Design a protein around this ligand. Structure first.
Ligand SMILES: [Mg+2]
Ligand SMILES: [Zn+2]
Lengths: 184, 154, 110, 294, 166
């Protein structure tokens, strides 16, 4: 944060729009916001979820679990959250000013995803395992009623592969028209 | 009562029946492979078979020339019959054509068939093949044939 | 003649749902050894017959283009040749058809 | 000694214990990319589970035509049992009875019928008598019949089965076919198989020679119902594959003074290669003749 | 109108404890406003009723009736979303549970007759419903054997009492 001047330049701009702002306490509330967002998916309280996460993040948390039961819980936090980088939007781009804050998660979580008929599909509800993900928050600085919300998650190219699914999947090959011979 | 009646009642009458068969035969001569309703293919097959027999008689034979003139609406096919088809089957005494069943056409679900002259330049049809000699049933029968063969010679 | 009384649904069910009125199950269905599509025992496979016709149509289109006019049927044999092919020793004095394609595997060359 | 009814119980328990152990050492869920290589529906890729999925499971993914017709699976060019779990990601090919060269399918069918017919030998005879099988000779298909080597008690030195006795053997086999037992395979260490068949000297010799020719010193055991046998090579998936079954006759090998060897013989034909009654009758006459390996 | 069949795919059951067995997957699919007679389509629906998905497709492919191809596509797309969206592992592990046809909305047209008369013809439309259940098709009910007749007759004889008395 010291060697990246753009981070503090972004921070002072956020302080310009809101004087009562601190960086040493944001990770604690951000983790609370992150946890509150995820436990919401258990009961699918989309009304309150609108106040906790961004409109861009909403489709990613709802579309794939529309007719599924999610049993998500938080057990432990391995490492305290750190403010990786803070950046702001361009000035007067479309009449609004946005601010992005990037924070790093290294905690322990639990997943239990069931299908339409209640049969287990993904995750296992008992054993927790370490989760390493990067979390970016956004807030509408210009809007007086704006607030920081879950916006986007970053997947590093070196991230470990996700846990394999329970069932087997067959991938069809290239379907061939009668005149089209098979080509590797 | 239709006992021994070997000719189907097709078309508008005996004249139309001959004309319909003649048109199918002419297309079979020109294109060497045509598809038509199954019943019409079977009826036309006999006329197609006998055409080569008249073609083998030679173009100088006046009876064959008159028969070829009537049965070939397009006059350009007469030299082809007397100089291409007849020389090709000179060593063959029968079975110049093979007839197969194809899936029914979507227009009226009619029984469809394909008839073509053997030795054509077109790509081969997916002819049905009997079982290979390497299968379990064939191998067992082959073993019976050998053991029976060794029993009689001894 | 006109019906005397209205036929009840019980009678109609006994007639419409008669066993011979039902569609009989076909037991002459098998998979094609080459393409894997369903076919009848006594009927040529739809997939393989149709792919032969398209090749035949393409060759026949080449036949007419080289022909260039009706009532000009050649008095010689015909042999179709694909890309990277040369006339054979027995292929002499016969009309040659050039196809801008590779010879199919099922199209065995004589 | 141990009664036959308890010998099957402990052998089944050992087989189940080994099967549980093989599953236990296997991790929970691993994905193997199995690619479908064949003339029908090429390029299909199956992402299955190691040591859990089977070539039959891949067959159900495509269609029931593969499940009904594919008698053998070809993994990397070597034959593979239909219900044998896969151990690695590899190309897969399926074989049917009506193929260009169904040599492996016929050989797999030939050995499969030997075990079925061999299984009913123990249950056929009286409890007081003792029956101890020797081995399953790899008799060629063209011989006309499959054979199994059995040794009977010292009471039945001059006893030869009649027509009714051979009829009873067929009836038991048809009931075995009717019950529709799938063929279960298990690749196991030689020492594990030795303690399973410690009560049979001939099976012990068969296990030790199979381990000798195998560099890994492991043998494959196949199970049908409650019966376990040491067989070499893949088998057909289930007992319902064979349609026409019959045991031809019984022949005595020579010499008999050191040991009495009875060569039971029979012939079979699957559902896919059903034959006419007259044709089957001639095959029965041919199969009754004694056959010996080269 | 009523469209309850479409909503039948939106019901979600609570997660199952390991004690209870596996709940078989079920999929509700239907095609509306087909230019076909419901009576004629009933025969095809009854034909493929109770059979496997792939066996039903084979039977429908070689059927000459026009409705056969309509059901064939309906079965094909029903199998697609079953594996893709309904957690179905094997696409061939499906059997037809119920298949039926219902009357759709139809128009009324005039058919001219001689002597200035007329008749009201009707352009018939119909719907087709189908439900697919994961798993092998259940075995058909075996014919009731003679011994089954024997015990049933005995039971009737043993179940008779002295009537119109104490
Ligand atoms: Mg008028
Ligand atoms: Zn085909």
């Amino acid at each position: 944060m010291k060697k990246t001047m753009a981070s503090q330049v972004s921070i002072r701009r956020i302080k310009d729009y809101d004087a009562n702002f601190k960086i040493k306490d944001f990770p604690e509330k951000a983790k609370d916001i992150f946890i509150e967002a995820h436990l919401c998916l258990n009961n699918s309280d989309h009304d309150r979820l609108h106040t906790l996460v961004t409109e861009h993040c909403f489709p990613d948390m709802t579309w794939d679990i529309k007719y599924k039961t999610v049993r998500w819980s938080f057990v432990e936090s391995l490492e305290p959250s750190h403010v990786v980088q803070v950046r702001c939007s361009s000035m007067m781009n479309q009449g609004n000013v946005y601010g992005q804050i990037t924070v790093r998660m290294h905690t322990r979580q639990t997943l239990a995803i069931y299908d339409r008929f209640g049969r287990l599909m993904y995750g296992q509800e008992d054993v927790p395992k370490d989760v390493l993900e990067y979390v970016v928050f956004e807030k509408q600085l210009t809007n007086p009623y704006g607030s920081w919300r879950m916006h986007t998650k970053i997947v590093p190219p070196w991230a470990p592969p996700k846990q394999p699914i329970l069932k087997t999947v067959m991938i069809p090959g290239p379907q061939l028209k009668p005149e089209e011979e098979y080509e590797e | 009562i239709s006992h021994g009646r070997v000719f189907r009642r097709m078309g508008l009458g005996p004249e139309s029946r001959i004309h319909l068969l003649r048109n199918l035969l002419t297309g079979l001569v020109r294109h060497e492979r045509i598809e038509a309703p199954w019943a019409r293919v079977d009826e036309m097959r006999g006329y197609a078979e006998k055409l080569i027999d008249y073609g083998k008689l030679g173009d100088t034979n006046e009876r064959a020339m008159r028969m070829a003139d009537f049965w070939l609406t397009e006059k350009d096919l007469i030299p082809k019959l007397f100089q291409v088809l007849a020389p090709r089957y000179k060593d063959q005494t029968g079975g110049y054509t093979r007839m197969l069943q194809i899936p029914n056409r979507s227009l009226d679900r009619a029984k469809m068939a394909v008839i073509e002259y053997k030795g054509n330049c077109l790509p081969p049809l997916p002819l049905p093949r009997r079982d290979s000699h390497l299968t379990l049933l064939n191998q067992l029968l082959q073993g019976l044939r050998q053991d029976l063969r060794q029993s009689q010679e001894a | 003649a006109a019906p005397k009384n209205r036929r009840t649904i019980e009678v109609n069910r006994c007639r419409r749902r008669n066993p011979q009125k039902l569609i009989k199950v076909k037991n002459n269905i098998d998979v094609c050894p080459e393409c894997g599509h369903l076919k009848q025992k006594h009927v040529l496979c739809a997939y393989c017959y149709e792919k032969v016709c398209k090749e035949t149509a393409e060759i026949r289109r080449q036949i007419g283009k080289q022909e260039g006019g009706p009532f000009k049927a050649p008095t010689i044999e015909t042999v179709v040749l694909y890309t990277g092919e040369t006339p054979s020793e027995q292929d002499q004095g016969k009309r040659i058809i050039e196809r801008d394609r590779k010879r199919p595997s099922w199209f065995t060359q004589n | 000694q141990l009664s036959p009814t308890e010998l099957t119980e402990m052998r089944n328990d050992l087989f189940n214990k080994e099967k549980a152990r093989q599953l236990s050492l296997t991790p929970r869920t691993e994905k193997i990319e199995v690619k479908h290589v064949g003339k029908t529906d090429p390029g299909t890729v199956f992402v299955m589970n190691k040591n859990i999925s089977t070539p039959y499971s891949c067959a159900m993914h495509l269609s029931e035509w593969y499940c009904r017709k594919s008698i053998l699976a070809l993994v990397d060019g070597q034959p593979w049992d239909m219900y044998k779990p896969l151990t690695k990601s590899c190309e897969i090919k399926f074989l049917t009875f009506k193929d260009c060269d169904p040599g492996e399918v016929n050989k797999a069918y030939w050995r499969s019928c030997a075990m079925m017919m061999g299984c009913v030998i123990e249950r056929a005879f009286k409890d007081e008598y003792m029956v101890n099988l020797v081995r399953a000779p790899e008799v060629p298909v063209i011989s006309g019949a499959f054979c199994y080597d059995v040794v009977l008690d010292s009471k039945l030195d001059e006893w030869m089965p009649t027509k009714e006795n051979l009829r009873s053997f067929t009836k038991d086999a048809h009931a075995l076919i009717y019950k529709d037992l799938p063929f279960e395979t298990l690749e196991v260490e030689a020492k594990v198989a030795l303690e399973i068949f410690q009560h049979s000297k001939y099976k012990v010799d068969f296990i030790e020679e199979k381990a000798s020719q195998n560099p890994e010193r492991i043998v494959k055991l196949h199970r049908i119902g409650d019966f376990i046998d040491v067989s070499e090579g893949p088998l057909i998936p289930r007992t319902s594959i064979c349609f026409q079954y019959e045991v031809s006759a019984v022949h005595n090998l020579q010499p008999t003074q050191p040991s009495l060897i009875r060569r039971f013989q029979g012939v079979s034909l699957p559902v896919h290669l059903r034959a006419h009654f007259t044709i089957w009758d001639k095959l029965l006459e041919r199969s009754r003749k004694m056959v010996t390996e080269d | 109108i009523s469209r309850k069949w479409e909503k039948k795919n939106k019901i979600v059951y609570p997660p199952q404890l390991p004690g209870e067995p596996r709940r078989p997957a079920e999929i509700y699919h239907c095609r509306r406003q087909i230019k076909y007679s419901k009576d004629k389509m009933w025969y095809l629906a009854k034909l493929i009723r109770g059979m496997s998905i792939d066996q039903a497709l084979a039977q429908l492919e070689f059927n000459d009736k026009k409705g056969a191809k309509i059901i064939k596509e309906v079965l094909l797309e029903a199998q697609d979303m079953a594996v893709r969206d309904h957690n179905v592992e094997f696409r061939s592990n499906l059997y037809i549970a119920e298949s039926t046809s219902g009357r759709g909305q139809c128009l009324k047209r005039i058919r001219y007759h001689g002597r200035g008369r007329f008749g009201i013809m009707e352009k018939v439309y119909c719907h087709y419903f189908v439900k697919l259940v994961e798993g092998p098709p259940p075995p058909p009910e075996p014919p009731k054997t003679a011994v089954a007749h024997a015990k049933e007759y005995i039971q009737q004889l043993r179940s008779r009492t002295i009537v119109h008395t104490l």
